[PDB]
Amino acid sequence: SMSYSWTGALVTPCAAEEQKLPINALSNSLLRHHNLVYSTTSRSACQRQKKVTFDRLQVLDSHYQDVLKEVKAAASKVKANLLSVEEACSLTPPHSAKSKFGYGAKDVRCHARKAVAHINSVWKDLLEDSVTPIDTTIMAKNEVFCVQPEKRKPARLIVFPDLGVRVCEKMALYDVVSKLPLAVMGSSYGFQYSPGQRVEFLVQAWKSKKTPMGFSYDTRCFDSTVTESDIRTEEAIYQCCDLDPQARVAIKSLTERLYVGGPLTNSRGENCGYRRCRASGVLTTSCGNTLTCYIKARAACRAAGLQDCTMLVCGDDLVVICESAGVQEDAASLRAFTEAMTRYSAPPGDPPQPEYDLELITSCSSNVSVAHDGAGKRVYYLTRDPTTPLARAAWETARHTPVNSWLGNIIMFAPTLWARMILMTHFFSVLIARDQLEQALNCEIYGACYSIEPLDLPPIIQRLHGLSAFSLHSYSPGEINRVAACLRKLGVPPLRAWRHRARSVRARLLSRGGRAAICGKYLFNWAVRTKLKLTPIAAAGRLDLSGWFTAGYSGGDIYHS
Numbered sequence: 001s002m003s004y005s006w007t008g009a010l011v012t013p014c015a016a017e018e019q020k021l022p023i024n025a026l027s028n029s030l031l032r033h034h035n036l037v038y039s040t041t042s043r044s045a046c047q048r049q050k051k052v053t054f055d056r057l058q059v060l061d062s063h064y065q066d067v068l069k070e071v072k073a074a075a076s077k078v079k080a081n082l083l084s085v086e087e088a089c090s091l092t093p094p095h096s097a098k099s100k101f102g103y104g105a106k107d108v109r110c111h112a113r114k115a116v117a118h119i120n121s122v123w124k125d126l127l128e129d130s131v132t133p134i135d136t137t138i139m140a141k142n143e144v145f146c147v148q149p150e151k152r153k154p155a156r157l158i159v160f161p162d163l164g165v166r167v168c169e170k171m172a173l174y175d176v177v178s179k180l181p182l183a184v185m186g187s188s189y190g191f192q193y194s195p196g197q198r199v200e201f202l203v204q205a206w207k208s209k210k211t212p213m214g215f216s217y218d219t220r221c222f223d224s225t226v227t228e229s230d231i232r233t234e235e236a237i238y239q240c241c242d243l244d245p246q247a248r249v250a251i252k253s254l255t256e257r258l259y260v261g262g263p264l265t266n267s268r269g270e271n272c273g274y275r276r277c278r279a280s281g282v283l284t285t286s287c288g289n290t291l292t293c294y295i296k297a298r299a300a301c302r303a304a305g306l307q308d309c310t311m312l313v314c315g316d317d318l319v320v321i322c323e324s325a326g327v328q329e330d331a332a333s334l335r336a337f338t339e340a341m342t343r344y345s346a347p348p349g350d351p352p353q354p355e356y357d358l359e360l361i362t363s364c365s366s367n368v369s370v371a372h373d374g375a376g377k378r379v380y381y382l383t384r385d386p387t388t389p390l391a392r393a394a395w396e397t398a399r400h401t402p403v404n405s406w407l408g409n410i411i412m413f414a415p416t417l418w419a420r421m422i423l424m425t426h427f428f429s430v431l432i433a434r435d436q437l438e439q440a441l442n443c444e445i446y447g448a449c450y451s452i453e454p455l456d457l458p459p460i461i462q463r464l465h466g467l468s469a470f471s472l473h474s475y476s477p478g479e480i481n482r483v484a485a486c487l488r489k490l491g492v493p494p495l496r497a498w499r500h501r502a503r504s505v506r507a508r509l510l511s512r513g514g515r516a517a518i519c520g521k522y523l524f525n526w527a528v529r530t531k532l533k534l535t536p537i538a539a540a541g542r543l544d545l546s547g548w549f550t551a552g553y554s555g556g557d558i559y560h561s
């Protein structure tokens, strides 16, 4: 079947959509080549529709069936519970699309009586009707990028049911999605790791091979490749768990009425078309993609005969490290891997390339690199080209945004030369200028929402990355050059100018005392010649990373209202 069928009605916006990077003095102090930075808008939705629309080829074989049997057997060990409406309400991210039934995410999060009553009615309907397709909205995601040489990117399309349905999805499945991937995949489950744990996993996997070869596999539009039978298989896996009787009914109803497909409506109420693939804005998008990618990849590894595979899966992101059989055989065996993935309906975007240097693999838009700590010891850490983080940071300085990618980037990429020298220096200077150091900000890391005060960054970073994150030095020539090239391209001041600026920022934070002084001492010790002794921060041991800062969860994109 075709992944989508369209009517000719357009994907329409809700509010005006800015295309060009707005300019203000503070955003310009970070990045001056503003004409290179753009936001995707509904204007390019038609271009995206053409790429995501295609027929699917699915031929399952014994290797696929063997893996599915293992997965169903593993799933049978899981006990998952129904979430109360109240817990499902509290997990709703702030600013997700309001309901068309007279309430928004803020009402849901507050457990407002009107929101709760409507959610209960949607729940009763899922228990009573297992077949009527549930309506979905299609929107063009507005995301910021830097223009490229060999290419602008069209907007991603987000497909989501109404807010009341979204809360019901958490009631029926949040506990299932929270437990099932680890039970099924064990150490291959990517979302259980911090950046430090992911790098440790990759390095250990690489070192475990006699002659390692690794590759990332880029599926062409993964959500569109997911078939009705894949979605019905995910439903069968969920049902292997020990579940509550109403959860079993609601899971079947959500699968048949929503997950397998359904009508697409634009913001103006017009019929846009029909979907027969993964909806990007449902609770099961991340879990379902992780499970389905894992099953297909593990089967394709076996179909290709790849030796001693170690896989790491985060949604549609796949990285495989195996035993090399020589360059010509590896090239042939990767083509066989691709051919099997193609038969399972996971065809390639860019064909995979065998890599013999761990640093040359990009996965979860990042690569392994090396630096040294305060004692000169080698430290592996995750980094990435800083172009998109910098372009987004400049937009977020010029415009108030609901979610701050800069904050998520400082958190995830705290040990990096670019996040420390540029992002921390810039944002702490902006927060000082605007008197906003104490205000909590939202960020989203692969759908996990967090509410964080900038003044809590040092204990959060210590707990997440370790004390070495404040002492890394001797970054690689390749890493230094990639950051330097990015700065010249975007019109960002050179690292030595940021170093000069950080000395003033660090001094201002120190003068404020308390948490602010800890920000100056720890985050900016790289900027001074005479170093301060960085001892473990007491607040780092007191906090809980996973639990104190959560502000909800989304399984996939969803429009910010």
Ligand SMILES: CC[C@H](C)NC(=O)c1ccc(N2CCN(S(=O)(=O)c3ccc(OC(F)(F)F)cc3)[C@@H](C(=O)NCc3ccc(OC(F)(F)F)cc3)C2)nn1
Pocket (backbone or CB within 6 Å): 177, 178, 181, 190, 191, 192, 193, 194, 195, 198, 286, 287, 290, 314, 364, 365, 366, 367, 382, 383, 411, 412, 413, 445, 446, 447, 448, 450, 452, 460, 464, 545, 546, 549, 555
């Ligand atoms: C529900 C079922 C589905 C399948 N699950 C999900 O969809 C899902 C989605 C997100 C998510 N989390 C928790 C673990 N981490 S975490 O980093 O430990 C962390 C913990 C607390 C924290 O709190 C603070 F914000 F307060 F600090 C901040 C961060 C984040 C993460 O995405 N990790 C993987 C990863 C690691 C490195 C990568 O590479 C590079 F580093 F390059 F980005 C890329 C991905 C966010 N967990 N689950």
